[PDB]
Amino acid sequence: GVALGATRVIYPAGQKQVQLAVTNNDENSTYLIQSWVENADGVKDGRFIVTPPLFAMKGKKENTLRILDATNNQLPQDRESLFWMNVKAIPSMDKSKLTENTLQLAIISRIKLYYRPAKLALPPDQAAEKLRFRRSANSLTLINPTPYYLTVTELNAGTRVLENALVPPMGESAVKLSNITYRTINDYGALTPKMTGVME
Amino acid sequence: FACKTANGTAIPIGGGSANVYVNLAPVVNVGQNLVVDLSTQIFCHNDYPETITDYVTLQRGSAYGGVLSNFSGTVKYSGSSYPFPTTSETPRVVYNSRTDKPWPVALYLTPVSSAGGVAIKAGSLIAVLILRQTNNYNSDDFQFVWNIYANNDVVVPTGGCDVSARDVTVTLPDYPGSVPIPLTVYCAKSQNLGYYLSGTTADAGNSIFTNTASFSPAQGVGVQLTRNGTIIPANNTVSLGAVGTSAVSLGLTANYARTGGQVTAGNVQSIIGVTFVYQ
């Protein structure tokens, strides 16, 4: 089908446009590509907008999406803000099958989009380790003191596999609950190194 | 004949060996070129140009560590591109000056699809390039060995996956029945995937997608989806777990479900979204 060249987009505040690659693999299919960004609540904000807002990808092809900052510098400047970028591949009307019963599937890819204010003091890579934990006998709470969203994955409490989790800037998340292990996904989509669950 | 490196570390008249430390593009996508330009760090001169002429070749180039496993590509020597790792000694270039000129060698490397994270580790050996020098005077045949060490990590960001849907599916029955919907996903780098459905729904339960045929339409019929028997309502994320190289089927069936008053014969056509959500 159509696939994106990343699993997330880092938008650095200040830049007028971030680029995102899309690619159609299906040698004999034509798709209309439409793209948009939503805020953390699912609302189609106009905070970010996608460049070309609507084009065709005929056969094996490669295109560039340009995500423009439409915020009016109205976003928090001391922490990331989570948005969702969706790129939808509208398949062409198949005229042959007008007189039959059909199901068309429109495949969409949805990835994180983090707006990243330009002067964060701690750096993206010094973020994961800075996590801490607070235990209860029902739950395990993650305390993210950094200004970056943390994709906590491979959350282990001894033998136990806990919920994967998304911990926001200078905030916390909670999971149903020994020695705590955890990884994080970075800006590149790669798993950080297994780390030791340090308490608060 | 002799050569030295931009860090001013030399290999004298008989040939011999040296390290070159290259700062690479820190992030390279699967389709892009990682260019390792050695003509800005490796410099040679002929020592007696008024009498002797020097002949210089790329005798061999070999790739190591993360360049050998995650990259494909070429070597441009003096205007021509050969395969790298190399398959044979290139043509000569002439050095006929005492002033240091570059050895015109550049590696053009493209990450393959299977490469992920750190495709070249900081501090590791990326390549070994052998400069071979001969002349029109004696039978001198010397080897200058340049060991290319990467100073930093080269990251190949993972891409989204590929959702291969064989058709734009005939659900006929015009009957009355059910049909599988061939829909598989695969990722070049194993990641957790989730999906959710979206479109116009007719029911409180919000799993029956409206009929939208606009050419002699049926009536009373919607289209519902099932993943091995389990109905999938719109906006309800279905967890696929880790999807790697091997295509995971979503195990979809299209079914007709009722939406209202008299069921009426005619065409039944619906369009549904399927949103795959990345971790």
UniProtKB/Swiss-Prot annotation, chain A:
InterPro entries: Ig-like_fold, PapD-like_sf, Periplasmic_pilus_chap, Pili_assmbl_chap_C_dom_sf, Pili_assmbl_chaperone_bac, Pili_assmbl_chaperone_C, Pili_assmbl_chaperone_CS, Pili_assmbl_chaperone_N. Keywords: Chaperone, Fimbrium biogenesis, Immunoglobulin domain, Periplasm, Signal. It is found in: Periplasm. Pfam families: PapD_C, PapD_N. One of its GO terms (cellular component) is outer membrane-bounded periplasmic space. The keyword Plastid does not apply. GO terms for biological process: cell wall organization; chaperone-mediated protein folding. It comes from the Bacteria. Its main location: periplasm. One of its GO terms (molecular function) is protein folding chaperone. Required for the biogenesis of type 1 fimbriae. Binds and interact with FimH. Belongs to the periplasmic pilus chaperone family. This is Chaperone protein FimC. It comes from Escherichia coli (strain K12). The lineage of its organism: Bacteria, Pseudomonadati, Pseudomonadota, Gammaproteobacteria, Enterobacterales.
Swiss-Prot record, chain B:
It comes from the Bacteria. GO terms for cellular component: host cell membrane; pilus; pilus tip. GO terms for molecular function: D-mannose binding. InterPro entries: Adhesion_dom_fimbrial, Adhesion_dom_fimbrial_sf, Adhesion_dom_sf, Bact_Fimbrial_Adh_Pro, FimH_man-bd. The keyword Nucleotide-binding does not apply. Keywords: Fimbrium, Signal. This is Type 1 fimbrin D-mannose specific adhesin. It holds the Pfam family Fimbrial. It is found in: Fimbrium. The keyword Signal applies. Involved in regulation of length and mediation of adhesion of type 1 fimbriae (but not necessary for the production of fimbriae). Adhesin responsible for the binding to D-mannose. It is laterally positioned at intervals in the structure of the type 1 fimbriae. In order to integrate FimH in the fimbriae FimF and FimG are needed. Belongs to the fimbrial protein family. The gene is fimH. One of its GO terms (biological process) is mechanosensory behavior. Gene3D superfamilies: Fimbrial-type adhesion domain.
